[PDB]
Design an enzyme around this catalytic site. Sequence first.
Site, mmCIF file in Angstrom:
data_model
loop_
_atom_site.group_PDB
_atom_site.id
_atom_site.type_symbol
_atom_site.label_atom_id
_atom_site.label_comp_id
_atom_site.label_asym_id
_atom_site.label_seq_id
_atom_site.Cartn_x
_atom_site.Cartn_y
_atom_site.Cartn_z
ATOM 1 N N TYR A 198 -9.035 13.018 -1.532
ATOM 2 C CA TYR A 198 -8.023 12.657 -2.527
ATOM 3 C C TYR A 198 -6.742 13.486 -2.297
ATOM 4 C CZ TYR A 198 -6.526 10.561 -6.956
ATOM 5 O OH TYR A 198 -5.864 9.848 -7.933
ATOM 6 N N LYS B 232 -1.755 14.055 -9.388
ATOM 7 C CA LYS B 232 -2.382 13.760 -10.684
ATOM 8 C C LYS B 232 -2.433 15.018 -11.575
ATOM 9 C CE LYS B 232 -3.284 9.306 -10.373
ATOM 10 N NZ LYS B 232 -2.425 8.331 -11.111
#
Lengths: 256, 248, 250, 256
Positions: free
Chosen positions: D157, D164
């Site tokens: 990720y 995020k």
Amino acid sequence: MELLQGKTFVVMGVANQRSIAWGIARSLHNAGAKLIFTYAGERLERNVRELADTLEGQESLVLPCDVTNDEELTACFETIKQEVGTIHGVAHCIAFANRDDLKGEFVDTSRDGFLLAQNISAFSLTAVAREAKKVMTEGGNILTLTYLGGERVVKNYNVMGVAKASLEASVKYLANDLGQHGIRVNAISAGPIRTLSAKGVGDFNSILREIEERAPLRRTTTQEEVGDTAVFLFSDLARGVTGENIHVDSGYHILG
Amino acid sequence: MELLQGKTFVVMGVANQRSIAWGIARSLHNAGAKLIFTYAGERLERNVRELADTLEGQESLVLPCDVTNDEELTACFETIKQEVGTIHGVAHCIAFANRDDLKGEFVDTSRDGFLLAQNISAFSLTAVAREAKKVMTEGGNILTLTYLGGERVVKNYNVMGVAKASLEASVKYLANDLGQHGIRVNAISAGPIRTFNSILREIEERAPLRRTTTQEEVGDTAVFLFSDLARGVTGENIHVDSGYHILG
Amino acid sequence: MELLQGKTFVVMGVANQRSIAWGIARSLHNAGAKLIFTYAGERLERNVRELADTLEGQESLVLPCDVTNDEELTACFETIKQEVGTIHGVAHCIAFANRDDLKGEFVDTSRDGFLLAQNISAFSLTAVAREAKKVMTEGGNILTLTYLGGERVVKNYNVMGVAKASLEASVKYLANDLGQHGIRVNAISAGPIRTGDFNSILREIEERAPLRRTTTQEEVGDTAVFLFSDLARGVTGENIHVDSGYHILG
Amino acid sequence: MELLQGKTFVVMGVANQRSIAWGIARSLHNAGAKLIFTYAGERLERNVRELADTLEGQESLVLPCDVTNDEELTACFETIKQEVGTIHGVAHCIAFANRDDLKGEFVDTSRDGFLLAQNISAFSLTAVAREAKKVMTEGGNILTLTYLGGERVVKNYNVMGVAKASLEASVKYLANDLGQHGIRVNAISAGPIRTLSAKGVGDFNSILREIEERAPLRRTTTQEEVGDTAVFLFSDLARGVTGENIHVDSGYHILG
């Protein structure tokens, strides 16, 4: 008024119209739910029935249930199984600690006071969940109430903060156990709610004032706000949500 | 080798050579500390005395302290006060639950098993702190051991997870109480230790440091927390777990 | 006094005597470490060289390292490689945001101010790690400094709070990357330090923090000594709060 | 079918019928809401219009909006102000990172790739909220979507996890800024959702399988579950909730 239509929920912890459990009950009823109420002491039995009576529609069942009493607890859900059959959720609004443990230093908490708080405020969720899964044939949600003091230190909250931490861990371990039976387990962390009418001087009034001044939404929490978040968690809209702690506290939890 | 020169610590929870508490004791000793050991019951006594005997320098004091026993607990630290005068901290490595409860669904935990686990594994920190503060004349640190299962759900950890959550919250409320008296209160969250092999191999594969934890790694972090190096640190939970706690 | 004997660390972010980075440097020095200091621009250079001169051992190497400049960054650690061969870690204490962004509503932050803050305060850790790993021949620790405002909302901290959140997440993703290479990555979250509205904040900490006092540069430095030492060899991806316990309060 | 009656929301990030933004839009429409759609590139223009036409009764306004473009963004919301006036919320479903940054070691992320991810996936919420508060005259909710990888490390990720994290911090700092204007700011952390039809081997299929095996609810997340939680957060039922990150991930977030 249809979100909970056709659904039946057990509400625990109603003592009087000021009870947070009663605020929750009102919201669930207004979303179409049928309610079953328990009462701890047959002291409280009168209050619950008259409160339950102010709810037009069919007569709500009202049963004894001491969560400290294993036999009385099983007998209660046994009755619900007999007379109602399937329920779709339980609202667990039960907490207690000796008032003198909410006073000075946490380091002076008595062993008995600690275990009493844990037994009533934390283990009671697991005790109730064990009985509830016997009647929650279609799955549903078990809700409990917590407070910021279970995550971070709140002045004077002391042994209740440790009990709420135990409760929040229980929510997680129960969610992990019960999810495979289609049962969700969640908590609402409510901010302080003005329930007394006297304003001005006072410790609790100082707490409320500081929340009005500092919380993101610049106001304190209402029982109706907690109740409407409960309606969500008991509804099908929340079917993907479990092991969660939703703060209904005007944003106060995000502050450093 | 002198980080803890002249200081005395009470180490609680030594059961055998593989105990985390014994790894802590060895690290404190290597840092120049004197040690006091507690035991409860006959078999712990024998192991603790034999292990304590293997430490160089002066004979280590070994004392009865059953943490479910308020009188024995008070008596223990009264004895310490009279015999050594001051200690600089306590390592609390006391944990227990019924094995029966570390198996099923947590929902099936008995009331007695739940309260037992809370009493021994969480309230004992507070009971010990209440007595230890009386003998910590120049302040210091109270340390406890926890595990990731107190923060997030670990398979089969069940009631011990809930007890470690209570323990962690107790650490915070104790830190808030005792800091004004110059006493810090901290936790170390230890990873699994190779002394279950699928669990250990998954840690070896996935943990950032690609290895499991050792008793010595935990011990050396304890040396930090008990030292003046950590004088600004309280209410903290340091993960000594090869980085595993950061994984999603 | 021997904890860091024979080890060499790069200290980034020394601006003056009150810098947290200078507190870290003094603590590393007292634990037996050799130090390499970086600077960016003329004014930092003078202070850094002056401060480094007061450390009595051998002359501390002082090198240009503008973390917004890829080539100067690479050039810095190339120089270090050729001059000293190996280092054992880096203390990254680099942070910046536009003054005017640290005032009003965070919602009014400009795109340029947001990206500037992210670039200098958060990405720089990754840029430095990428270079430092080439010189960290026997592994070690990369340390960065953060603040509670990266986890929870602190009044007026605004865009720096968002940048510290990015920094803290970078610490975790870097730890996951570099641990296999024997490199730990950790953060210290320092409380406000007494060096206007700023002493009401300091007075509130003195009244409410568990230890009833504000943080000192030396308290932060001594925790840095721990993280850089082999005492902390099992610790990575962690954020140690050195803030008198304030972080635990609700 | 009435929770959002009388309310109007801007939906951002629709690209095709598989977009999570589209899943949200369908849930909002079914709860009685009226919708405004933005399109990023004029490539996606035809997709959004055709998709908007799926929703019948009302005729959805469909506007250009590149959140990286300050002028186009301000122009977009001034149009909403002219034609519609008051809106009651914005669903921000915008994220991007270079596909080669979601690959190796995070430590090799390029400066430009990092800033690009931050600009589009994190700053865009603040940029949008700044314009939105001009038309949210009666308050309401701004919603964004995040993922567990912004709190904990998820393999590959990488730079999106860091973006995020900036997004989730922005949610908090925005909640603190905007609550006094009656605007709530919240995130939903969605678990991985099966969008592809291919089963069997594959890295994403292995991820989905591990969630089905280990998540408390023993299943992966659907767009409808995310959409139904969005309905709650945009509704008056959530008026006490701000600065919150609700995990809609079958309980996966609670696991150690």
